Design a protein around this ligand. Structure first.
Ligand SMILES: O=C(CCC(F)(F)F)N1CCC(c2ccc(F)cc2)CC1
Length: 205
């Protein structure tokens, strides 16, 4: 089964404490080694991680767990891939490099970057594909909240996607998604990701 860089766990101990919960029983349940959060270049089970997110959200009545966890994460979780992204010429170049090398983060993640004459914007379409996992709802929300942070870092603190799209129906509060994503959010769609206009895409880093 696929690994993911264990930077994707940054904040889990802190958030779990914020919610009044002991993280250690969760880590052991999902076969995640307890210190791995803080071990650079370590990798963890992607299946374990996504199931742990779902259990943390469900058992703690925290529907926006994934969105909240992104507050401790952002571009730095991409480790070597962040170094490549920051050295691109334009925000597009940065995000497309992330897409090209996203397998370095986890082989289970696919980013499709496309634009078409027939439609507005550059679309960043994102998929988690891992045999045997439940639909990684919290995983997708964490991914997109991270993406929004990455847009602001690479694109300047005013930079926003035009839209975020999720396959699932809205779970958390309106306020939760607005705070994390900071734009139109569409739910229950055929694709997951975000779009950026060409003006922002071509902005120098
Ligand atoms: O937070 C995660 C993964 C969380 C997990 F594993 F649960 F899915 N990720 C951070 C954001 C990243 C990304 C970067 C640029 C894009 F345009 C789209 C996505 C995917 C991995």
């Amino acid at each position: 089964g696929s690994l993911i860089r264990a930077t994707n766990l940054w904040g889990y101990t802190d958030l779990m404490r914020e919610l009044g919960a002991d993280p250690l029983p969760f880590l052991r349940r999902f076969d995640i080694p307890p210190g791995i959060e803080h071990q650079e270049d370590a990798f963890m089970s992607l299946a374990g991680f996504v199931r742990m997110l779902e259990a943390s959200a469900a058992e703690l009545d925290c529907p926006d767990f994934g969105l909240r966890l992104a507050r401790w994460q952002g571009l730095g979780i991409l480790g070597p891939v962040a170094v490549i992204a920051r050295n691109a010429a334009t925000l597009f170049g940065g995000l497309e490099a992330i897409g090209r090398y996203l397998y370095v983060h986890s082989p289970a993640l696919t980013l499709t970057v496309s634009s078409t004459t027939a439609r507005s914007n550059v679309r960043f379409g994102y998929e988690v594909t891992e045999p045997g996992i439940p639909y990684p709802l919290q995983g997708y929300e964490l991914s997109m909240a991270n993406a929004a942070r990455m847009i602001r870092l690479l694109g300047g603190p005013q930079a926003r996607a035009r839209v975020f799209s999720f396959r699932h129906a809205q779970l958390g509060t309106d306020a939760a998604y607005r705070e994390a994503l900071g734009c139109t959010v569409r739910f229950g769609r055929t694709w997951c990701g975000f779009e950026v206009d060409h003006r922002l895409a071509g902005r120098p880093i």
